[PDB]
Amino acid sequence: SPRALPFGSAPATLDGSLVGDVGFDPIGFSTAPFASFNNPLYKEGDFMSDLEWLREAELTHGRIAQLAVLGFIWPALFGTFPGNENFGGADAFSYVNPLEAITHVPDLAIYQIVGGMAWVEYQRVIRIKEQGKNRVSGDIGLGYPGGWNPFNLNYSPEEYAEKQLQEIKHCRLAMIGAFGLFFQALNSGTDIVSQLSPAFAAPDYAAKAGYFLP
Amino acid sequence: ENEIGALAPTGFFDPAKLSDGISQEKFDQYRLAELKHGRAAMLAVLGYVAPETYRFGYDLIPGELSTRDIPNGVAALNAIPFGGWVQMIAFVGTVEAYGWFTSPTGVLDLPADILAKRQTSELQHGRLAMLAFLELIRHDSQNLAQPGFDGYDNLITGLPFLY
Numbered sequence: 323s324p325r326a327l328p329f330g331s332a333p334a335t336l337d338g339s340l341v342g343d344v345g346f347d348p349i350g351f352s353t354a355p356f357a358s359f360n361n362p363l364y365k366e367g368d369f370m371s372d373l374e375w376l377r378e379a380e381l382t383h384g385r386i387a388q389l390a391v392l393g394f395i396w397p398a399l400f401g402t403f404p405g406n407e408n409f410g411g412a413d414a415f416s417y418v419n420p421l422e423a424i425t426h427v428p429d430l431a432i433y434q435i436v437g438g439m440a441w442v443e444y445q446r447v448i449r450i451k452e453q454g455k456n457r458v459s460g461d462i463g464l465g466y467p468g469g470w471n472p473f474n475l476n477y478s479p480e481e482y483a484e485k486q487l488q489e490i491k492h493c494r495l496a497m498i499g500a501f502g503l504f505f506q507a508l509n510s511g512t513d514i515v516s517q518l519s520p521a522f523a524a525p526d527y528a529a530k531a532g533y534f535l536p
Numbered sequence: 537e538n539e540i541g542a543l544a545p546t547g548f549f550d551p552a553k554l555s556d557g558i559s560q561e562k563f564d565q566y567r568l569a570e571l572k573h574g575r576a577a578m579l580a581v582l583g584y585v586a587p588e589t590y591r592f593g594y595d596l597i598p599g600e601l602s603t604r605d606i607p608n609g610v611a612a613l614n615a616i617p618f619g620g621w622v623q624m625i626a627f628v629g630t631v632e633a634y635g636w637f638t639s640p641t642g643v644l645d646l647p648a649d650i651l652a653k654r655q656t657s658e659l660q661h662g663r664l665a666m667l668a669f670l671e672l673i674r675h676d677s678q679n680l681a682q683p684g685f686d687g688y689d690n691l692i693t694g695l696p697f698l699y
């Protein structure tokens with residue numbers, strides 16, 4: 323196991339089951355049944371692989387957390403909260419602190435995005451419940467080679483391999499980063515712009531005034 | 537009785553008759569016991585530290601008696617109503633006799649080598665947590681007496697950043 327270099331992995335952890343198969347699985351819960359834990363829509367049929375189900379789990383989490391990162395920076399930096407609400411500055415642009423932004427925004431848009439991801443997972447289950455064989459992260463049509471939407475994916479199988487690698491890695495690293503940003507802002511009551519910009523500056527306490535010299 | 541439960545500190549620590557005799561007749565029972573004790577005391581230590589920075593906002597007696605106000609440490613025991621802790625324990629005892637959640641099933645495979653090593657490490661950690669719970673309770677009560685009889689006032693003497 324090169325990730326955990328001086329250690330052994332599961333008696334049956336695979337190297338080709340998922341792209342991210344460097345062997346990192348210290349407790350390696352992959353070994354455990356990883357089945358329809360508490361009846362997780364049990365199928366007993368193809369049922370993918372229990373490892374592959376944990377893989378779909380990591381994929382969903384990392385994808386959501388990746389989007390979450392940009393939703394922690396762009397509200398501040400990129401677009402500077404283009405809330406541009408017809409009225410009601412609160413629950414809009416004004417709350418640039420992401421935690422406070424959630425604190426304000428009415429349950430209208432909350433239920434909007436809730437039903438959005440609800441239809442998302444409804445279609446995901448609709449695929450995967452039938453999409454046996456290779457569940458392949460419940461891919462279905464979503465930007466697949468058939469490209470169920472615009473610019474239907476036009477790449478090569480080697481490019482597809484590299485792209486799977488890109489996605490998986492970025493999702494894992496973003497799963498770290500979202501934790502980062504969240505604990506940051508909560509334990510500072512600010513937004514990332516605040517601490518990072520006074521950091522890249524010179525404190526007002528010491529500035530050597532200005533070059534008022536003759 | 538020289539089974540798992542021994543390491544470099546002592547090959548069989550039992551400076552009394554305690555070990556010898558009841559050969560596999562009390563040794564397994566004592567393993568059950570020490571296991572349960574060490575696990576619970578580990579949970580205790582995690583208990584003490586976690587109320588110091590975080591606090592779940594639930595109102596134990598609805599309307600009032602909100603977690604955010606009850607003292608941490610031993611003082612909660614005096615606070616927590618007798619019957620309230622009785623109901624809490626009754627849930628715990630049902631859990632012990634029903635396996636309700638708390639990983640009701642699922643322990644992976646863990647081949648016998650790694651499994652034995654994990655079990656030994658478990659025993660050692662829980663044993664240590666027993667002593668950790670001891671020191672904590674000691675300090676707490678002693679301070680409760682003369683406010684800073686021990687000296688260092690803040691409850692968790694180490695981990696100074698918390699307090």
Ligand SMILES: CC(=O)O[C@H]1CC(C)(C)C(=C=C/C(C)=C/C=C/C(C)=C/C=C/C=C(C)/C=C/C=C(\C)C(=O)C[C@@]23O[C@]2(C)C[C@@H](O)CC3(C)C)[C@](C)(O)C1
Pocket residue numbers: 388389391392464465466469470471472492493495496498499500502503506
């Ligand atoms: C037709 C269709 O729809 O199909 C779709 C398929 C699909 C795949 C959706 C498509 C695509 C590609 C997509 C969406 C790719 C998205 C990738 C995304 C969004 C990847 C974010 C990563 C963020 C990470 C890793 C973390 C970074 C940041 C980290 C780790 C930090 O260090 C943050 C740090 O902040 C702290 C923690 C503290 C600060 O003190 C210091 C700094 C600032 C340094 C298409 C093309 O749209 C088509």
Ligand SMILES: CC(=O)O[C@H]1CC(C)(C)C(=C=C/C(C)=C/C=C/C(C)=C/C=C/C=C(C)/C=C/C=C(\C)C(=O)C[C@@]23O[C@]2(C)C[C@@H](O)CC3(C)C)[C@](C)(O)C1
Pocket residue numbers: 578581585638639640641642643661662664665667668669671672691692693694695
């Ligand atoms: C299948 C399923 O669903 O899940 C799985 C999940 C998983 C993980 C696999 C499972 C497991 C195993 C688990 C959960 C193991 C958990 C182990 C755990 C939680 C172990 C804590 C040890 C803490 C110690 C030793 C603390 C010592 C602390 C000590 C010695 C101190 O110094 C205390 C000190 O206090 C003083 C005295 C003074 C203070 O001034 C300073 C401090 C505070 C520092 C299960 C059960 O199989 C179920």
Ligand SMILES: CC1=C(C#C/C(C)=C/C=C/C(C)=C/C=C/C=C(C)/C=C/C=C(C)/C=C/[C@@]23O[C@]2(C)C[C@@H](O)CC3(C)C)C(C)(C)C[C@H](O)C1
Pocket residue numbers: 346347348349350351383386387389390393394420421423424497498500501
């Ligand atoms: C969109 C948005 C919001 C949001 C949001 C949300 C919901 C963000 C959520 C982010 C989320 C959901 C982040 C999850 C991280 C999970 C991690 C990091 C797991 C790591 C687990 C690790 C590192 C463990 C690795 C292991 O090796 C270990 C240690 C033992 C091994 O045996 C087994 C394995 C291999 C497992 C607000 C706040 C609502 C409004 C705001 O305005 C913007």
Ligand SMILES: CC1=C(C#C/C(C)=C/C=C/C(C)=C/C=C/C=C(C)/C=C/C=C(C)/C=C/[C@@]23O[C@]2(C)C[C@@H](O)CC3(C)C)C(C)(C)C[C@H](O)C1
Pocket residue numbers: 549550551552553554555573574576577579580581583584608609610611612613666667669670
């Ligand atoms: C967490 C929390 C609370 C709590 C709690 C709870 C439930 C805490 C539980 C604590 C618990 C369960 C603590 C066990 C200790 C067992 C010990 C110390 C055993 C030692 C035994 C020793 C040292 C024996 C050593 C021997 O060598 C001898 C001497 C002779 C040899 O022949 C045999 C051996 C080698 C064995 C409060 C207080 C209710 C409220 C608060 O707010 C929050």
